[PDB]
Design a protein around this ligand. Structure first.
Ligand SMILES: CC(=O)N[C@H]1[C@@H](OP(=O)(O)OP(=O)(O)OC[C@H]2O[C@@H](n3ccc(=O)[nH]c3=O)[C@H](O)[C@@H]2O)O[C@H](CO)[C@H](O)[C@@H]1O
Ligand SMILES: CC(=O)N[C@H]1[C@@H](OP(=O)(O)OP(=O)(O)OC[C@H]2O[C@@H](n3ccc(=O)[nH]c3=O)[C@H](O)[C@@H]2O)O[C@H](CO)[C@H](O)[C@@H]1O
Lengths: 490, 484
C-alpha cells in the first residue's frame, strides 16, 4: 500500500481533506501522518458519526436493591468479613480508570500523579497502592495466608508512557510488578458537524480517549478478561482515579454485593444539591441505569420526595462492582449495544490556511461511551450508599476555577477525615500550650488553619487500629502516623 | 492618682506601666469598668451539656420544602406586615478580622459578581425590592428600617461607604447605625493586655453584645417609636441572605412566636454552623466550636444527623421580646471564651507577635437569648437558596470564600431563569444543559446575575425570559437584559 491507495481509501470515506497539507509536510511528518491514518477504520468512524448525529420516565431504585452503610450498620461486620474472605482467597481484583487526559487542572501529567498537598505529599497513585497493600496485609492476619489483589490500570494513548515510568520509578509502591497490569483504551477522532475528521496540526488528527465506557473494547483488545479468568478472579472493583478518599477494594462494598448475589453494583453517596455534577442511579422501564448529570433536566434534578430529600438522590461516585462472568458477557456480547454520548466541543484545529486556531464557537463533537451503561445488562444489580465525608472528595478543578472539587478541598477532606479517626479512637489535639482544641476549629484570624492530620493506609484503612496509638493522648498538629511511627510536624 | 488608684483596687495597675513615656490612653482607660471586667473574666474562666442535648422537635419546626403548601399564606402575612410598616431588619456588622485579608468590613466586600455589587448594596436592594413589592400588593408606600450594628472597628468605614453610595437608594433617616460595646483581651492570669505601650488590646464583645448596644443608644425605644412589631436579625457575610424575608416572618407571625431561628439542614458533622437544639426544656444553639464530635456525628434512624438544624444566623424577634431582653434578661447572658495569640507590649517596651496563645477573648452570642422566649420556632430552608457564607479568603481552607459565594449566587440565578421558562445557549445557538460538563481549562459555569430590584426570590421573571434564549454572562437589572 502507498500514498495512492490511502488517498483512495480516505476519498471514498469522505475524508480526503486529511491529506491536504501532505506536500507541505517534512518527510518525517509525512511518515507519522501516514502511519496514524493507516491505523484508522474510516468506515467504522463514519458509522459511529452517523449514529451519533442521528441521536439528536425515570424512577428511583427500589429500597430492596439499596444497601446503606449508615442505615444497615448492623450488617457491616458481616459484609466486611465476606469481603476480606474473598480477598484472602485471591478472588478479588481492582480496575482503575486512568485514561482521562486534557488536564483542566493546568498540568500535563495524569491525575494519578497529582500531589494534593497532603503532609506526606503522596500522590493519588501511592495512596491507592497503599490501600491495596493494607487489605492484603489485613486479610493475611485474619486468615493466615498471603493473598493478592491484582491491579488492572486502564491508561489511554496520552497517559500510558508517563504512568508506566512513574510506577517503575516508585518500585510499584511496594506491590509486585507482575500484579499490576497496564492496558490501553482506544481513541476516537474529533469530528466537525459536517462529518469531517478534524486535524489538530497539519500532520496530526485531533484524537481523544473514547470515554471510560471504552474499557470494554480495551478489555477485549488486550485479553484482560482472559487474564482475570486465568488468575482465578471472581470480583472486580472498578473505580475513578481522582477521589482522594476512594476505598480501593473496599471489603464492605464487595461483601455487600457478594452477599446479595449481585453481578453488578454501584456505590453512591446522597445527592443533596440539585445541581451537583454527579450522574444519578435510577431505573426506566424496569431497567437500571445512570442518567449523567449533563443529561438530566433541572425539573428532574430538583424534584423532591415527601420526606424532603431529592427524589433522585443516589449520586454515582464512579465506584462499581462487576463479577468476571458479567464482564465476559459484556465484552463478547453487549459492548456493541453501548451508545456513544455526544458532546459539542471547541476543538483546537489547523485551518485551510495552515494556522492553529482556538474556536470561539463549538466546531465539532466528541464521542464517548460511559462505563456505567452496562448496568442495564446486569442480571442482578444493587446499590450501596456511603457517607461522602468518609468516601468521596473528587479532584476535577484547579483551585482558580469554580471553587469546588479541587486540590484544596481534596486535601482538607482527607485531613478532616483522619482528624476524625483520631478523635473517635480516643485521641485529642492540642495547641502550643497544651490546651485541648475543639472538634471544629474556630477560624477567625488570617493565620488560623484547620487541624492537619494524616494516617497512612498501612496503619489504618478506615479508622480502625488506632486506639493503641492515640487513646487518651494529645497531639500537636500536623500529626502523621505511618509505618515509621507517630510524628508531630514542626 | 484618682484613676491611677482605680487600677490599683483592681490589680490592673500594670496598664500605666508605660505612663512615664498619654492622652488617648486615658480616654480609653477611663471608659472601662475594671470592676466588671474582673467579674466577667473570673466567671468566664470559672469551671473552665452534650449529654443533655435533645433534637429540635417536629412541633416547633417548619419547612419551606415540606410545608410548601403554606408558603403562599406565610408570604402574604409577611408582605402584609411589611406594608403596614410593622417590619424592621437589624444587620450585625460589628465584626472585623484579618481573615479575608482586607482592612475594611465584610459588607464592603466585592466577591466578583458580574455587577461587582458589594454585600451591602445587594442587601439594600433586597430591602428596596420588598418595599416596592409591598406597595404594589397593598397600594401604599411602606418602609423597612435598617438598623446596622457596627463596632469601633467598622463604624466609620461603614457610615462613609453608605453616604458615598447615597444609601444605595434607601432613605438616610431609615437606616440607623448604632455601635456595640467592646471588651479587652486578657492573659490567662487575668491581666488586661496592652497592645501598644499606650493602647489596650480591644475587640467587639460578640454579636451577643447587641443587647447592651440596644440599651446604650435607646434602639428599642426607636423601634416602638416607629410602630415596628417584628425584627429580622441577620449576619452580613451571606450573599444569599433573604433580608426581611416575608416567608420566614410570615411563618413566625402566623405561628404566634416571639423568637424564631432560620436554619438549613446540616449534613456534614464537622460543618462550622451552630446547631439549634433543646437543653433541659429550653432552646439553645450549641456553637460549632463547643460541640463534641460524638454528638456532631450522631445519626437518627432515617440516616440524617440527629442534630441537623444548622443555624444560619437569621433570627426573628418581636419588639416586645427584645425589650424584655434589654431590660431584664441581658445580665443572665454568659461569656463564651476563646484562647488567642494577642500581639502585645511586654516589659522593656518590647513589642512582639505571640507564637503561642497568650490570652483569651470574651464574647456574648446573639442566640443565647433563645432560652428566654415564650414561643420559639424553627424555620428550615434550602441552603442553595439562602446560605452561602463568606468566611475565608480563597488562599485558605477552600470553602466559604469569595469564589464559592459568587458561584452560589450565579448558580441560583441561573436556576431562576430556567424555572421561569428561560434557556441558555452556546455560541452556535445550541441549548446548554442545566448542569454543564466542565472538562476543559476554559470551561466555566453559566454566569448569571439578577438584581434584587428585578427578582427577590425568582419571581416576576416570566416577561423577561420565558421562552427566550440567552448567551451567558447574563445580567438582568433595572436597565433591562444584558449579555456580556
Ligand atoms: C462517565 C462517568 O464515569 N461519569 C461519572 C464521573 O464523571 P466525570 O465527568 O466527573 O468524569 P469523567 O467521565 O471525565 O471521568 C471519570 C473517570 O474516568 C476516567 N476516564 C474518562 C474518560 C476516558 O476516556 N477514559 C477514562 O479512563 C478518568 O480517568 C476518571 O478516572 O465521575 C462523577 C463523580 O466525580 C460521577 O460519578 C459521574 O457520573
Ligand atoms: C455566634 C454566631 O452567630 N455564630 C454563628 C456564626 O458563627 P461565626 O463564628 O461564623 O461568625 P461570627 O460570630 O464571627 O459572626 C457572625 C455575625 O456577627 C457579626 N459580629 C461578630 C462578632 C461581633 O463582636 N460583632 C458582630 O457584629 C459579624 O459581623 C457577622 O455578621 O455564623 C455561622 C455560619 O453562618 C453560624 O451560623 C454560627 O452559629
Amino acid at each position: 500500500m502507498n500514498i495512492n491507495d490511502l488517498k483512495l481509501t480516505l476519498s471514498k470515506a469522505g475524508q480526503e481533506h486529511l491529506l491536504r497539507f501532505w506536500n507541505e509536510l517534512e518527510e518525517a511528518q509525512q511518515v507519522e501522518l501516514y502511519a496514524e491514518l493507516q491505523a484508522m477504520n474510516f468506515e467504522e468512524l463514519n458509522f459511529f458519526f452517523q449514529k451519533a448525529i442521528e441521536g439528536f420516565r425515570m424512577e428511583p431504585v427500589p429500597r430492596e436493591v439499596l444497601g446503606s452503610a449508615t442505615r444497615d450498620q448492623d450488617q457491616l461486620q458481616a459484609w466486611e468479613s465476606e469481603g476480606l474472605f474473598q480477598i484472602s482467597q485471591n478472588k478479588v481484583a481492582v480496575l482503575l480508570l486512568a485514561g482521562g487526559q486534557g488536564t483542566r487542572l493546568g498540568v500535563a501529567y495524569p491525575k494519578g500523579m497529582y500531589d494534593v498537598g497532603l503532609p506526606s505529599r503522596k500522590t493519588l497513585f501511592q495512596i491507592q497502592a497503599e490501600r491495596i497493600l493494607k487489605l492484603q496485609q489485613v486479610a493475611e492476619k485474619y486468615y493466615g495466608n498471603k493473598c493478592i489483589i491484582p491491579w488492572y490500570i486502564m491508561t489511554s494513548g496520552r497517559t500510558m508512557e508517563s504512568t508506566k515510568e512513574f510506577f517503575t520509578k516508585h518500585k510499584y509502591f511496594g506491590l509486585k510488578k507482575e500484579n499490576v497490569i497496564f492496558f490501553q483504551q482506544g481513541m476516537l477522532p474529533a469530528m466537525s458537524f459536517d462529518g469531517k475528521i478534524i486535524l489538530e496540526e497539519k500532520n496530526k488528527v485531533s484524537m481523544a480517549p473514547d470515554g471510560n465506557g471504552g474499557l470494554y473494547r480495551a478489555l477485549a483488545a488486550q485479553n484482560i478478561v482472559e487474564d482475570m479468568e486465568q488468575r482465578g478472579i471472581w470480583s472486580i472493583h472498578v473505580y475513578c482515579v481522582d477521589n482522594i478518599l476512594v476505598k480501593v477494594a473496599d471489603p464492605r462494598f464487595i461483601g455487600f454485593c457478594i452477599q446479595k448475589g449481585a453481578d453488578c453494583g454501584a456505590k453512591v453517596v446522597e445527592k443533596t444539591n440539585p445541581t451537583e455534577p454527579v450522574g444519578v442511579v435510577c431505573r426506566v422501564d424496569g431497567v437500571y441505569q445512570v442518567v449523567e448529570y449533563s443529561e438530566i433536566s433541572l425539573a428532574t434534578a430538583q424534584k423532591r420526595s415527601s420526606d424532603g430529600r431529592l427524589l433522585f438522590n443516589a449520586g454515582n461516585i464512579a465506584n462499581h462492582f462487576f463479577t468476571v462472568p458479567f464482564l465476559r458477557d459484556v465484552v463478547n456480547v453487549y459492548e456493541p449495544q453501548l451508545q456513544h454520548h455526544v458532546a459539542q466541543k471547541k476543538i483546537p484545529y489547523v485551518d485551510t490556511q495552515g494556522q492553529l486556531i482556538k474556536p470561539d464557537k463549538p466546531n465539532g463533537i466528541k464521542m464517548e461511551k460511559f462505563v456505567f451503561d452496562i448496568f442495564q445488562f446486569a442480571k442482578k444489580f444493587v446499590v450501596y450508599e456511603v457517607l461522602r465525608e468518609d468516601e468521596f472528595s473528587p479532584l476535577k478543578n484547579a483551585d482558580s476555577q469554580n471553587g469546588k472539587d479541587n486540590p484544596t478541598t481534596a486535601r482538607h477532606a482527607l485531613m478532616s477525615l483522619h482528624h476524625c479517626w483520631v478523635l473517635n479512637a480516643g485521641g485529642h489535639f492540642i495547641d502550643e500550650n497544651g490546651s485541648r482544641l475543639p472538634a471544629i476549629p474556630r477560624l477567625k484570624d488570617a493565620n488560623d488553619v484547620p487541624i492537619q492530620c494524616e494516617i497512612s493506609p498501612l496503619i489504618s484503612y478506615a479508622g480502625e487500629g488506632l486506639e493503641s496509638y492515640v487513646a487518651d493522648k494529645e497531639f500537636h498538629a500536623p500529626l502523621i502516623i505511618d509505618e515509621n511511627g507517630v510524628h508531630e510536624l514542626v
